[PDB]
Amino acid sequence: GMFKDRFKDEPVQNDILQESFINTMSAWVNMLLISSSGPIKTPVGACATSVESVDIGVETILSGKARICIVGGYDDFQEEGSFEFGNMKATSNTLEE
Amino acid sequence: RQQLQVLARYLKMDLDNGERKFLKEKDTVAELQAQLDYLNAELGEFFVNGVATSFSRKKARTFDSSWNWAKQSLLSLYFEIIHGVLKNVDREVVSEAINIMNRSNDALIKFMEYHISNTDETKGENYQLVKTLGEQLIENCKQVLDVDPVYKDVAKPTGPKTAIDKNGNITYSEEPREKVRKLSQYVQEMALGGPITKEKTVSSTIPRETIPFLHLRKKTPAGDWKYDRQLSSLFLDGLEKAAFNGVTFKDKYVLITGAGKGSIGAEVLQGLLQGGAKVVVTTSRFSKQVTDYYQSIYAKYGAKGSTLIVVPFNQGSKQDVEALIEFIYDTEKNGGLGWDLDAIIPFAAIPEQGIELEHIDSKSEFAHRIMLTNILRMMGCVKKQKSARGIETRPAQVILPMSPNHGTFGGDGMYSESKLSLETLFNRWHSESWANQLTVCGAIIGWTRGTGLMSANNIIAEGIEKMGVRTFSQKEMAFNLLGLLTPEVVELCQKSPVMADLNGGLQFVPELKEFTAKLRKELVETSEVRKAVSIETALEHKVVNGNQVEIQPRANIQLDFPELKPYKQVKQIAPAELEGLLDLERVIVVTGFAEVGPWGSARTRWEMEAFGEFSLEGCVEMAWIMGFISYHNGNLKGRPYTGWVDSKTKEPVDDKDVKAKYETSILEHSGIRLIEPELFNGYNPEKKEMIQEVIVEEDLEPFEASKETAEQFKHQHGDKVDIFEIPETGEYSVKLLKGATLYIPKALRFDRLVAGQIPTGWNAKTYGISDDIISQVDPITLFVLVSVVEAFIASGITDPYEMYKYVHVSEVGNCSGSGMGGVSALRGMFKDRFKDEPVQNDILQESFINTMSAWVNMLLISSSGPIKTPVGACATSVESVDIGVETILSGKARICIVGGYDDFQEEGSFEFGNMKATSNTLEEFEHGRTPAEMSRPATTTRNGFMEAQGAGIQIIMQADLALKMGVPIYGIV
Amino acid sequence: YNPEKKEMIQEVIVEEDLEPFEASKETAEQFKHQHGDKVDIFEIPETGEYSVKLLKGATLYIPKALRFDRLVAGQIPTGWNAKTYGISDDIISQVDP
Amino acid sequence: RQQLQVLARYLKMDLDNGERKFLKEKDTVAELQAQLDYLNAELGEFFVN
Amino acid sequence: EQGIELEHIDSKSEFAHRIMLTNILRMMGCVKKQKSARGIETRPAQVILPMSPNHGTFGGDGMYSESKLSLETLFNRWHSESWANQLTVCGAIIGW
Amino acid sequence: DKNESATINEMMKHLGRSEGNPVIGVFQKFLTGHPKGAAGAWMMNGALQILNSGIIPGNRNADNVDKILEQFEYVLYPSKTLKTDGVRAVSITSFGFGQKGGQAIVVHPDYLYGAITEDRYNEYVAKVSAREKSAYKFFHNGMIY
Ligand SMILES: NC(=O)C1=CN([C@@H]2O[C@H](COP(=O)(O)OP(=O)(O)OC[C@H]3O[C@@H](n4cnc5c(N)ncnc54)[C@H](OP(=O)(O)O)[C@@H]3O)[C@@H](O)[C@H]2O)C=CC1
């Protein structure tokens, strides 16, 4: 939205920027379901994000800062990321397959 | 051409219409220019340019938070006394205590009582002294809780003093007066008068047949103003009371013009604010400097219930006068102040020097406008506002600045005409219909040393006084004038106009111009003679007898490790039971820190933050950071040189000269400032590029392209494009057809124009980062790499591998993070690639928030410890500290890199503006704010944050390991 | 998003004046600001709109399409919809997928 | 109209030159009129005349 | 200037002030410059100033009284400046 | 600014801070602006500098403190730098989009030394002094080259 749709003057919601943050997903989880005031530590670990998340949640509970934690990970698939992964030759070429 | 003409005639299109209209418009332009030229020839450039408006309501600045400044003042006094800066209760201390009493309330009493009861008098004599002085101050403040604040000047009166050295050097000083050391004694002196002014309360002492130096006059039946004993006794008794008990101006609304720094008006304004007045103060030079000056005045003198409103104003513009009075009287819902004035003090004036009768021209006419015509207009405007609201019982006292010398000195343009003309108001008050809305108080101001109108004459004030006459300091004259705002004189003015002679008997000196010229020539001659004789004697000595080394500072930048006390003192600070009670493996300490930001490093940023300006070491560091200077060691122009050279010209630069050479440019290109496109890939918020989709209405002209490109166009557009091979060359022609889609660039004006930017010239190469790295990584990564290296230097660790002599490679963590990561790489992927610009193939890796930490490990640290990268928007750094502490306390690491970083780029700025999180810069300009005042946390007018960029890093570790390693410990987390 | 036809933009310098096209006054001024003297904008007296005429040397962007060779992905099952789980459409229109 | 445009381009004659110059001149006229209006607001009609 | 009290002082009163005081000073100055450019030091021009005995006493006359009272500075400026050889001052306080 | 003042004020109220003893607010962003993630780190650096110097910088852009903040009696808003005889602890707070609230407390380093013996302290002091001299040598070499 921010980098392309706005550049072409498409209609983009005014608060689009907040919706891109890696920690906004957890913000919405708290704002719609949980309503806690506990620790909120959002890891970014590329493809090891979920394991990093478990490590942090365990450290948080063992440090006495929380007794329950939501851990895990998530990511989406979109055009630009696919192209860039193909440029790096990380993904399988489908024509070759 | 003939075929074109035939077609044009068929179509009925007049090809010459545009030229015809243009020639008519040019005639109109010439007419208007002739009119403007005539007005400029009649009025002159000075007048025409000088009547330009300055006033606008949005630029008004309000100061009313005296409830906070009082505690700030108390603390400043408390610590200055504890540090021995103030050893004695001198006049400045007494004045400060008076200003504190003027803002006293129950909360302030609790504040003072807490801080004094908790002062340990045993810690030396300064603490006992502060405790004793605080106890007295508290007792005084308790008395005045429900009492009105008072203006009460306690300064020691000063007299003029001119001295001529052996070599004929002329110096003027304001020495304290020997016999007058209080204002009460000053009032007694004024009441006594002198031999030259010769033809219970202080007024009892006025001798028979002598005129007081300050007195009031009464108009006789014949219409001449003569000295009146009873009225002068009233005035002098009021002054006596003011000097002893002080005087309150609570609930008085005042407009004052011409009260800039160094004027009598400035002293009058501070007196008014001390007494609790609500004051509107105008200025013809509205700037950050002037607004800061007034803010400091209010913070120092603004008593409880007092307000100061600072507005730009050109008294030379009648529209400004009308708009200012309208603003003062308009309701607040309507954007005005909702005030009704109790006093007008129109002291604005401009200097006229060397303008004799035949030189009277544009400037003198404009000065006459300011000092007389628009003063009458201001009175008229107030009269109309008061009458439109039926106000008949709340008159505004006008304090007219009158002069005792009309035409006596010459060379002052129309000054004397203006001053003498003001005197008509004494009679017009009685002959017209505005006496219920305005009263007239004429103040004949005497010789006042130090102003823009009299400064050039300080050197003869001593001889003038030798004649038995009194000259006045600006503080004394302001006290005299404030004497005219007491209730008794105010009632007197409501009875009939009052004329106050504040001239100190100067009118009794005959032939004043010649007398002062004689004094001046005496002094000038003595000075010149002595200088010439001394020069000649020195030269004779140097020919008859024939024929110190100074050291310049060199910058010595320090790392600033914490000072370590003797074990005895450090043992005194913490409880004796703490020894051996704590598990030092569980105590986290900060052993180093660093940052890359708009004010350079943490050293230069701290200098700017704490002291407001750069030391020599700070200036040299900023110059080196910005690339202004570079080090040289070798032959330079043949001769050997070791030191700093200018980076561009390569000329040698001494450390002492760095400030003069560079400081101004360093400050201009550091901190919050206008966005510089060269620092952001050409980004210019005034011309923001956009793309608009347009459907082609008619076929385009064919353009050439390679076969692959042409096929891509065909694939996109299908049948709305035609591509044909060119047999000769193998290229293709591309012809877009009707209905094909196109994108036309258009530009947008964005209203966020200012940001906190890393200093212009900052370059990672200066720190030693090779350009293969620089071309590989996103810029944010360079900020982080420099910050991590510097943080380790602050820890005393120059080689990070030294860490592995104490800990395993699995025990060094990096928990630092970012809100957004490599946003420039994101721009690459989402926009530059979309336009087929050259973008490096691995751009995607450079955008990850955790890639910065990956590069830190891959280039410097080489650990296999924990790597937990937080993302916490604007709380990222605090989250990072929390995680690093948890990691160390969990036993997974013994050392961690914590901190945060983010960059500034076009898209993020636009989106923050769309959310209205940041301050609108056009709106800030409308309020007169410069870039350096747009970030004002906790103030009344704050309206959005200022965006910045950079990185901050800290090294944390277990206290036990820090002790073992011998690294500096800056604090315990 | 179709990886077989991936949209791109190519900058082309106009070789000959374009045919005028209409636009609102604000849009026309934005075009003028961008292009300077390489565009002519003239108010239409009847309606108040403006005519926009790009001139020789003006910059334009022509869409072109690219074939990408990554055609397969692990996708959430077709028909998956947050409304099925009970999430209101104000949330759905607010947040990122 | 299209034939006229082709001829105009061949001859290198800018058919819109006059209108461009006129619009610039009209901007200049507005500027000068604003200055004169300001002087009339500061000084008043009686003085100026 | 009739019916112009303090609050009505506007364009007309400013123009009247120009005529009756400022441009009178300019006329004196112009004569002084012409006489001095020709080195005339012994042929002074007597200026007969029309002065008023009532300054502000009646009201409603705009800036008339300001102009009239301002002319009186010339009595002292004759002595304090350098134009006394080219101009002399004769103040006439004109009656009813 | 309102939210944060209210929060710090309630913290102090609940914990029985002495009346008449407000905490001195520091607002470093007046000078540097807001980085979106480095903010707390810049504050942490400022806090350590405050602790080791005893100097409390003033908000020079605090021209007029908002009247709504007068209700928070435990907070003081200075406009100019104060040289104290010692700051013993500093609070650092930050609030980020997405309900990211955080706080850190940094205590003066001299309180650590009360926990160790004299011999250990003296050996630490010697080691630190040597390390500091090496660091100066390295810093200036690296700067000029
Ligand atoms: N000095 C003396 O001893 C005597 C003074 N007086 C009179 O007392 C008054 C006081 O002035 P003084 O204290 O001498 O210092 P100044 O006469 O130097 O002060 C005049 C002030 O007016 C302000 N000003 C100038 N032009 C304009 C404008 N166009 N609009 C608004 N404000 C303007 C200036 O402040 P800024 O640039 O900050 O706005 C300036 O500081 C004067 O009117 C003077 O004639 C009379 C007799 C003796």
Coordinates of C-alpha atoms in Angstrom, one line a residue, chain B residues 426-622:
Chain B
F426 CA -3.4 67.3 28.0
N427 CA -5.9 69.8 26.6
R428 CA -7.8 67.4 24.2
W429 CA -8.7 65.3 27.2
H430 CA -10.8 68.1 28.3
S431 CA -12.1 69.4 25.0
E432 CA -13.3 66.1 23.4
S433 CA -15.4 63.1 24.3
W434 CA -12.9 60.3 25.1
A435 CA -12.0 61.2 28.7
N436 CA -14.1 58.3 30.2
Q437 CA -12.2 55.7 28.1
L438 CA -8.6 57.2 28.4
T439 CA -6.7 59.2 30.9
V440 CA -3.4 61.1 30.2
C441 CA -0.2 60.8 32.3
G442 CA 2.6 62.7 30.7
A443 CA 6.1 61.5 31.8
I444 CA 8.9 63.9 31.0
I445 CA 11.7 61.4 31.0
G446 CA 15.2 62.6 32.1
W447 CA 18.7 61.7 31.1
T448 CA 18.6 57.9 31.2
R449 CA 22.0 56.2 30.7
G450 CA 22.1 53.0 28.6
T451 CA 19.3 53.2 26.0
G452 CA 19.2 53.1 22.2
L453 CA 18.3 56.8 22.5
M454 CA 21.0 57.9 24.9
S455 CA 23.8 55.3 25.0
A456 CA 26.3 57.5 23.1
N457 CA 26.3 60.0 26.0
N458 CA 27.2 57.8 29.0
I459 CA 30.7 59.3 29.0
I460 CA 29.7 62.8 30.0
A461 CA 27.1 61.8 32.6
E462 CA 29.6 62.2 35.4
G463 CA 30.3 65.8 34.5
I464 CA 26.6 66.6 34.0
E465 CA 26.1 65.2 37.5
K466 CA 29.0 67.4 38.8
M467 CA 26.8 70.3 37.8
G468 CA 24.4 69.1 40.6
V469 CA 22.0 67.3 38.3
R470 CA 20.9 63.7 38.4
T471 CA 21.1 61.2 35.6
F472 CA 19.2 57.9 35.9
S473 CA 19.8 54.3 35.2
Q474 CA 17.1 52.5 33.3
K475 CA 16.2 50.6 36.4
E476 CA 15.7 54.0 38.3
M477 CA 13.7 55.5 35.4
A478 CA 11.5 52.4 35.3
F479 CA 10.9 52.7 39.0
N480 CA 9.9 56.3 38.5
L481 CA 7.5 55.4 35.7
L482 CA 5.9 52.5 37.7
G483 CA 5.4 55.1 40.4
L484 CA 2.7 56.5 38.0
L485 CA 0.7 53.2 38.1
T486 CA 0.1 53.3 41.8
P487 CA -3.6 53.6 42.8
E488 CA -3.1 57.2 44.0
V489 CA -1.6 58.5 40.8
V490 CA -4.2 56.5 38.8
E491 CA -7.0 58.2 40.7
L492 CA -5.3 61.5 40.2
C493 CA -5.1 60.9 36.4
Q494 CA -8.8 60.1 36.4
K495 CA -9.4 63.5 38.0
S496 CA -7.4 65.4 35.3
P497 CA -4.3 64.8 33.3
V498 CA -1.1 64.6 35.3
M499 CA 2.3 65.8 34.2
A500 CA 5.3 64.1 35.8
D501 CA 8.7 65.7 35.6
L502 CA 11.3 62.9 35.9
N503 CA 14.1 65.1 34.6
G504 CA 16.3 65.3 37.8
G505 CA 16.8 69.1 37.5
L506 CA 18.4 69.0 34.1
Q507 CA 16.2 71.8 33.0
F508 CA 18.1 74.1 35.3
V509 CA 21.4 73.8 33.4
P510 CA 21.6 76.7 30.9
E511 CA 22.8 76.3 27.4
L512 CA 22.6 72.5 27.6
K513 CA 23.8 71.7 24.1
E514 CA 27.0 73.8 24.5
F515 CA 27.7 72.5 28.0
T516 CA 27.5 68.8 26.9
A517 CA 29.5 69.5 23.8
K518 CA 32.2 71.1 25.9
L519 CA 32.2 68.1 28.2
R520 CA 32.5 65.8 25.3
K521 CA 35.3 67.7 23.6
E522 CA 37.2 67.9 26.9
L523 CA 37.2 64.2 27.2
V524 CA 38.0 63.5 23.5
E525 CA 40.9 65.9 23.6
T526 CA 42.4 64.5 26.8
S527 CA 42.1 60.9 25.4
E528 CA 43.7 61.8 22.0
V529 CA 46.5 63.9 23.5
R530 CA 47.5 61.2 25.9
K531 CA 47.4 58.5 23.3
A532 CA 49.5 60.6 20.8
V533 CA 52.1 61.5 23.5
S534 CA 52.4 57.9 24.7
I535 CA 52.9 56.6 21.1
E536 CA 55.6 59.2 20.5
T537 CA 57.4 58.5 23.8
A538 CA 57.3 54.8 23.0
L539 CA 58.7 55.3 19.5
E540 CA 61.5 57.6 20.8
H541 CA 62.4 54.9 23.4
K542 CA 62.4 52.2 20.7
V543 CA 64.8 54.2 18.5
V544 CA 67.1 55.4 21.2
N545 CA 67.5 52.0 23.0
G546 CA 66.8 49.7 20.0
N547 CA 65.2 46.3 20.2
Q548 CA 55.5 36.9 26.1
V549 CA 55.0 33.6 24.4
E550 CA 51.3 32.6 24.5
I551 CA 50.0 29.0 24.3
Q552 CA 46.9 28.1 22.3
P553 CA 44.6 25.3 23.5
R554 CA 44.6 22.1 21.5
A555 CA 41.6 19.8 21.7
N556 CA 42.2 16.7 23.9
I557 CA 39.1 14.6 23.5
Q558 CA 38.5 12.3 26.5
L559 CA 36.5 9.0 26.8
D560 CA 34.9 10.2 30.0
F561 CA 35.0 7.0 32.1
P562 CA 33.2 7.2 35.4
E563 CA 35.3 8.5 38.3
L564 CA 36.1 5.9 41.0
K565 CA 36.3 7.1 44.6
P566 CA 38.4 5.8 47.4
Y567 CA 36.8 2.7 49.0
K568 CA 36.1 4.7 52.1
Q569 CA 33.7 7.2 50.5
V570 CA 32.1 4.5 48.3
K571 CA 31.6 2.4 51.4
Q572 CA 29.9 5.4 53.0
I573 CA 27.2 5.6 50.2
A574 CA 25.6 2.2 50.5
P575 CA 24.4 0.4 53.6
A576 CA 27.1 -1.5 55.5
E577 CA 25.0 -4.7 55.3
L578 CA 25.1 -4.7 51.5
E579 CA 28.6 -6.3 51.5
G580 CA 28.3 -10.0 50.4
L581 CA 24.5 -9.8 50.3
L582 CA 24.2 -9.6 46.6
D583 CA 24.8 -12.2 43.9
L584 CA 26.9 -10.2 41.5
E585 CA 26.2 -12.6 38.7
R586 CA 22.6 -11.4 38.9
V587 CA 23.3 -7.7 38.8
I588 CA 23.2 -6.2 35.4
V589 CA 25.4 -3.1 34.6
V590 CA 26.0 -0.9 31.6
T591 CA 29.7 -0.9 30.7
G592 CA 29.5 1.2 27.5
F593 CA 27.2 3.1 25.3
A594 CA 27.2 5.1 22.1
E595 CA 24.9 6.7 19.5
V596 CA 24.7 8.1 16.0
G597 CA 22.2 10.9 15.8
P598 CA 21.4 14.4 14.7
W599 CA 23.9 15.9 17.1
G600 CA 26.7 13.5 16.3
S601 CA 28.0 11.1 18.9
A602 CA 26.9 10.8 22.5
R603 CA 29.7 13.1 23.6
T604 CA 28.6 16.0 21.3
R605 CA 24.9 15.3 21.8
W606 CA 25.4 15.5 25.5
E607 CA 27.4 18.8 25.3
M608 CA 24.6 20.3 23.2
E609 CA 21.9 18.8 25.6
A610 CA 23.4 19.9 28.9
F611 CA 25.3 23.1 28.0
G612 CA 23.7 24.4 24.8
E613 CA 27.0 24.9 23.0
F614 CA 30.2 23.1 22.0
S615 CA 33.5 23.1 23.9
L616 CA 36.7 23.0 22.0
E617 CA 36.8 19.2 22.1
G618 CA 33.1 19.1 21.0
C619 CA 33.7 21.5 18.2
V620 CA 36.7 19.5 16.9
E621 CA 34.7 16.3 17.1
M622 CA 31.8 17.8 15.2

